[PDB]
Every structure is written in C-alpha cells, then in structure tokens.
C-alpha cells in the first residue's frame, strides 16, 4: 500500500536528523580537549540498520570512533600524562563538512518523496 | 438505537477520534518551543475500541534525542504524524460521505 | 532541529575565547602581568535516548 511510505519516510528523516546532529556536535566540539569527568572528547558516529525484505532505516546506536587520538605535548595542563601529552579529539573536519551536506540533501529528497506520495494518495482518494 | 444509528456511529466516532488526535497534534506542535514540554499523543486503535465499547488517556512519546531545555517534541516526526492524521481524516470523511450517499439514493422513486 | 542551538552556543563561546585573547593581547606591556589561559570545555546532554 501507500501508508507504509509515511513510516519509511519518517524513519529516513529521523535518521538523517540524527546524522546531522552528530556532525554538528563533532564540529562544535572539534577543539574541546576536556570532559566533565576528565576524559578527553572523542568523535562519535551513528550506525544505520534496515528494520526488516526491504524497509526503512533505523539508527541502531552511536559509537565512539576507533581512530587514534591526536595528542600534543604541553606539561602545563594537569590533564597531561607522565610524558606531558594531552589528548585532543580525533575528529576530522572535512569529513563532517561533507556529512552535513549529504545529510541535508538526503533529508530534502526524503521529504520530497513524502510530499509526492501524499499528493498521489489525495488524488487516489477521489477515484 | 437500531440500524442506521450504529451503522453510521462506527464511522462518526472514528472521525471524532481523528479530530481529537489532530487537535492534540496541533497543540503539541504549537507548544514546540516551550522548555520542559512533553510530547502528547494517544493510541488510536485502543482508544477507538474503548470508545466503541463505551476522558481519553494521553500517552507520552519517547524522546528521539535529548535537549538541555527539557523539551521532547520532535518537529519532523510531528509534522509527518500531522499529515498522516489529516489524510486519514479525509479518507474517513469521504468513505462516510459515499456510504451516506449510497444510503440516500435508495430513497428514490 | 536543535543542532542550531549547539552551533550558536559554539559560536558564542568562540567569541568569548576571542575576547579573552584580545584582553591578553591588549595589556601586553603592563608590568607584572599574567596571561589568561583558555580552553574549550565539552558538556554532553544525555538521557533515555541516543
């Protein structure tokens, strides 16, 4: 039918919104070397899944990136280890920059699909 | 309380439920920026069954992602639900109108 | 929809850090002056979902 289209498009919109929020958060915290509990900030990424045939998309979980943490040398900060190294976040910039554009474009495509299907259903209603 | 009454009541109460859910959606989309607001919605199937058997208890939607201000309304999902409910209301209205016109056509000649 | 708030908060804190740096640079010749260190701090919002 066509009612499943609303569910599919809503799931896609939610997933794209989560991806955009994650990218924005990474860009904002790209240069924040600390945490409320003292642990350095680490880049995070969402994981997509297919929610059972075919179907929409869902965000299974947000996981920390396993890329090595960039570290700089300054003994002044108390956060420094025995060798004077502190751990800056290992978050790429251009990756997030392209993720934002890709997420926005996918969001627009999904909402256009939703609007088209709604118009088709309205036209079907007057058979 | 016989025949026509219930035969059209099953759809009239469905339309009433759709209208009430639409009003709740409008309220929670108009209140989408007040801090500490909770999204409100109802389970249409259970509510319709309870109404038919013969005040509606509104449930809280699980937040999609947190925010500091405490608001838990999700704008895109709310808009999608609003559009879906409007389309369902129109479908109910048109099927009710077609059924009523078919009933009225019998009382001719 | 609320990522705009995170972005504007980051921008405002960047402006605050810029103000701190400008303050440090302005009085670069006063005798016995100590610079004002600064570093961005992360605060994660959380609860019940993602």
């Amino acid at each position: 039918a066509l009612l499943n289209i609303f569910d599919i498009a809503g799931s896609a919109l939610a997933a794209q919104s989560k991806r955009l929020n994650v990218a924005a958060s990474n860009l904002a915290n790209a240069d924040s070397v600390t945490g409320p509990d003292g642990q350095p900030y680490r880049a995070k990424q969402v994981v997509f899944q297919v929610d059972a045939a075919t179907g929409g998309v869902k965000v299974a979980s947000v996981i920390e990136s396993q890329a090595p943490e960039k570290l700089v040398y300054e003994p002044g900060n108390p956060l420094a280890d025995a060798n004077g190294y502190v751990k800056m976040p290992n978050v790429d910039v251009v990756g997030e920059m392209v993720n934002t554009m890709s997420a926005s474009r996918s969001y627009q495509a999904n909402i256009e699909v939703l609007n088209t299907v709604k118009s088709m259903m309205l036209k079907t209603l007057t058979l | 309380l016989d025949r026509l009454d219930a035969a059209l009541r099953f759809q009239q109460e469905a339309l009433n439920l759709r209208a009430q859910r639409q009003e709740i959606l409008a309220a929670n989309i108009a209140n989408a920026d007040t801090p500490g607001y909770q999204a409100r919605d109802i389970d249409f199937a259970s509510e319709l069954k309870k109404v038919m058997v013969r005040a509606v208890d509104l449930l809280y939607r699980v937040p999609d992602q947190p925010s500091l201000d405490g608001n838990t309304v999700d704008m895109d999902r709310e808009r999608t639900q609003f559009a879906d409910n409007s389309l369902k209301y129109q479908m109910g209205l048109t099927v009710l109108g077609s059924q009523l016109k078919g009933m009225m056509n019998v009382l001719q000649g | 929809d609320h990522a705009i708030y995170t972005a504007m908060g980051a921008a405002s804190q960047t402006l605050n850090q810029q103000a701190v740096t400008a303050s440090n640079l302005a009085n670069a010749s006063t005798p016995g002056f100590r610079a004002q260190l600064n570093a961005l701090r992360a605060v994660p919002v959380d609860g019940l979902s993602l």
């Binding site: 409320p36 965000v59 | 500490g36 909770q38 919605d41 449930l59 937040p63 999609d64 999700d74 | 609860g47």
Partner: peptide
C-alpha cells in the same frame, strides 16, 4: 522504548552539568 514510539511514563529531565561533583 524504541525512539519515536509511544510510552506511558514521562522522560526524566535533562541536566547537562558543567562538571560533576
């Protein structure tokens, strides 16, 4: 509950503290 679903209990308030005690 899964995100976007219905629930019978309100979500706990969001705090976001600057630094834990």
């Amino acid at each position: 509950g899964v995100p976007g679903a219905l629930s019978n209990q309100p979500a706990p308030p969001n705090e976001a503290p600057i630094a834990t005690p």
